[PDB]
Design an enzyme around this catalytic site. Structure first.
Site, PDB file in Angstrom:
ATOM      1  N   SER A 179       0.794  -1.227   0.000  1.00 36.64           N
ATOM      2  CA  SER A 179       0.000   0.000   0.000  1.00 36.64           C
ATOM      3  C   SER A 179       0.820   1.266   0.000  1.00 36.64           C
ATOM      4  CB  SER A 179      -0.989   0.022   1.172  1.00 36.64           C
ATOM      5  OG  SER A 179      -2.148  -0.732   0.871  1.00 36.64           O
TER       6      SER A 179
HETATM    7  C1  CEF Z   1      -2.149  -2.112   0.918  1.00 38.99           C
HETATM    8  O1  CEF Z   1      -1.201  -2.755   0.459  1.00 38.99           O
HETATM    9  C2  CEF Z   1      -3.357  -2.844   1.500  1.00 38.99           C
HETATM   10  N1  CEF Z   1      -2.943  -4.189   1.933  1.00 38.99           N
HETATM   11  C3  CEF Z   1      -3.604  -5.267   1.481  1.00 38.99           C
HETATM   12  O2  CEF Z   1      -4.582  -5.207   0.741  1.00 38.99           O
HETATM   13  C4  CEF Z   1      -3.055  -6.621   1.945  1.00 38.99           C
HETATM   14  N2  CEF Z   1      -2.480  -7.463   1.054  1.00 38.99           N
HETATM   15  O3  CEF Z   1      -2.409  -7.034  -0.522  1.00 38.99           O
HETATM   16  C5  CEF Z   1      -1.551  -5.899  -0.781  1.00 38.99           C
HETATM   17  C6  CEF Z   1      -3.135  -6.952   3.228  1.00 38.99           C
HETATM   18  C7  CEF Z   1      -2.835  -8.181   3.661  1.00 38.99           C
HETATM   19  S1  CEF Z   1      -3.079  -8.135   5.300  1.00 38.99           S
HETATM   20  C8  CEF Z   1      -3.550  -6.606   5.391  1.00 38.99           C
HETATM   21  N3  CEF Z   1      -3.899  -5.982   6.512  1.00 38.99           N
HETATM   22  N4  CEF Z   1      -3.537  -6.069   4.171  1.00 38.99           N
HETATM   23  C9  CEF Z   1      -4.019  -1.997   2.576  1.00 38.99           C
HETATM   24  N5  CEF Z   1      -3.046  -1.600   3.586  1.00 38.99           N
HETATM   25  C10 CEF Z   1      -3.389  -1.174   4.802  1.00 38.99           C
HETATM   26  C11 CEF Z   1      -2.351  -0.464   5.419  1.00 38.99           C
HETATM   27  O4  CEF Z   1      -2.398   0.829   5.535  1.00 38.99           O
HETATM   28  O5  CEF Z   1      -1.358  -1.095   5.972  1.00 38.99           O
HETATM   29  C12 CEF Z   1      -4.723  -1.085   5.265  1.00 38.99           C
HETATM   30  C13 CEF Z   1      -4.993  -0.631   6.557  1.00 38.99           C
HETATM   31  C14 CEF Z   1      -5.836  -1.408   4.487  1.00 38.99           C
HETATM   32  S2  CEF Z   1      -5.483  -2.769   3.331  1.00 38.99           S
END
Ligand code: CEF
EC number: 3.4.16.4
Length: 445
Positions: A179
């Site tokens: 992210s």
């Molecule tokens: C950003 O990468 C996104 N993460 C995901 O969707 C995850 N895996 O695919 C990339 C994932 C696996 S476990 C988990 N909590 N997320 C978003 N990232 C966050 C962040 O700010 O760290 C979120 C709070 C929402 S999901």
């Protein structure tokens, strides 16, 4: 080797403190190499070993430290002619001891036990590397022993250790940014004319173009109760589907261009330590673009590159070339080389950097406040990134990139907690952020 160790190898220092020095002993090889805080500074110093040669700055700055450097030839002539005990030169690093220590401490205590991964801290305006932390690390004194069995035993242990303590994970390893890459996707959109007010799907699920594969928000929930949300909202909540859409909206070329503009896919300069090149990937089709926009598919960043994205935005869109060596000195502490800051390039306009700053200030507000510093406005983005052949069943990497104070930034960090404490519930906000915040807190004292 007997002649090399007959003369006093110079010092590697940080903040006028010693990271590596040589003591005169009664050994066959007179000088013993000492590392007073071995594991903490091992990514920086590397080792210097009779049997196994040198690494990192002991290797990179070898001629200065052993005194063979042509800029030191005059001193060496003066030393002999006068009957002075010959000494090598000093390497003065850019490392801030307190930021380096706090980054190390936070990694040891931050994963219910020690974290695997990296912490990098930069001075955005200069490009100084204030901290270069890798965990697990190792003890260079093991390899500096004048006993061959001690060295050989350590070498065998290090190379058999599956956690690979010798690896500087800050600069040698690349990881999906997850992210945190939404910062790049947002920059590309913003530079193509999109605004913070742009309306993006709130849907919990999004099909990828030309594939059965689907991407989801965490965890199967809409971004909000409306069919669409603003880019700003999508960013601060880190809503996946919103950015899949946005990236496909913005398109492959604009994303490639913004990744290049942020240092991806151009060979990094040495620091003088060699940095693995980060990449956005080929992005062969639109499915791939979907996944790329949220920092997956073939996107791979070093911790250092991810901290440079933060340092760039913090520096009004201007990337300073990162460097680890402040100055090279002679034995008499006479200067020989002062490194000077230079602007590698402009990634984004000042306006776009300002918009990203605001979005990150807001993303920091949504995130959990464990480690929050009283009255310090941090700009940040978290990320939790899937990896490996079995992504959904493997503990993700926990990421956090930040700068502070967001108003007039003095420090930028990236924290990578590799395999997220070996926990499958791992997130950048849970693990990587408080670590990140501790380093920022050590920086602003
Ligand atoms: C950003 O990468 C996104 N993460 C995901 O969707 C995850 N895996 O695919 C990339 C994932 C696996 S476990 C988990 N909590 N997320 C978003 N990232 C966050 C962040 O700010 O760290 C979120 C709070 C929402 S999901």
């Amino acid at each position: 080797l007997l002649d090399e160790y007959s003369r006093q190898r110079g010092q590697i220092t940080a903040g006028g403190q010693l990271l590596a020095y040589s003591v005169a002993t009664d050994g066959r090889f007179r000088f013993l190499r000492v590392y007073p805080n071995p594991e903490v500074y091992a990514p920086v110093t590397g080792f210097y070993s009779l049997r196994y040669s040198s690494t990192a700055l002991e290797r990179a700055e070898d001629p200065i430290l052993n005194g063979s450097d042509r800029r030191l030839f005059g001193r060496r002539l003066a030393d002999f002619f006068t009957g002075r005990d010959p000494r090598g030169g000093n390497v003065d690093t850019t490392i801030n001891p307190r930021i380096q220590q706090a980054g190390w401490d936070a990694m040891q205590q931050g994963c219910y036990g020690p974290c695997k991964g990296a912490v990098v801290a930069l001075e955005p305006s200069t490009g100084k590397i204030l901290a270069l932390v890798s965990s697990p690390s190792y003890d260079p004194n093991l390899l500096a022993s004048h006993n061959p069995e001690v060295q050989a035993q350590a070498w065998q242990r290090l190379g058999d250790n599956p956690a690979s303590p010798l690896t500087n994970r800050a600069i040698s390893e690349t990881y999906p940014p997850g992210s945190t890459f939404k910062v790049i996707t947002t920059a590309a959109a913003l530079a193509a004319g999109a605004t913070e007010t742009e309306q993006l799907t709130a849907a919990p699920t999004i099909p990828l173009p030309g594939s059965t594969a689907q991407l989801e928000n965490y965890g199967g929930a809409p971004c909000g109760d409306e069919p669409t949300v603003s880019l700003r909202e999508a960013f601060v909540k880190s809503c996946n589907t919103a950015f899949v859409q946005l990236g496909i909206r913005t398109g492959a070329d604009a994303l490639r261009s913004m990744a290049r503009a942020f240092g991806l896919d151009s060979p990094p300069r040495p620091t003088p330590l060699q940095v693995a090149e980060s990449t956005v990937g080929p992005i062969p089709d639109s499915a791939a673009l979907g996944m790329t926009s949220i920092g997956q598919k073939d996107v791979a960043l070093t911790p250092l590159a991810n901290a440079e994205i933060a340092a760039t935005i913090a520096n009004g869109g201007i990337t300073m070339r990162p460097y680890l060596v402040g100055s090279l000195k002679g034995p008499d502490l006479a200067n020989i080389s002062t490194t000077v800051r230079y602007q590698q390039r402009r990634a984004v306009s000042p306006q776009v950097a300002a918009k990203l700053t605001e979005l990150m200030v807001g993303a920091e507000k949504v995130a959990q406040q464990k480690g929050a510093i009283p009255g310090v406005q941090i700009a940040s983005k978290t990320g939790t990134a899937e990896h490996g052949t079995d992504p959904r069943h493997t503990p993700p990497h926990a990421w956090y990139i930040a700068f502070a104070p967001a108003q007039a930034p003095k420090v930028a960090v990236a924290v990578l907690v590799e395999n997220g404490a070996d926990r499958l519930s791992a997130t950048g906000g849970a693990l990587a952020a408080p670590i990140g915040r501790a380093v920022i807190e050590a920086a602003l004292q």
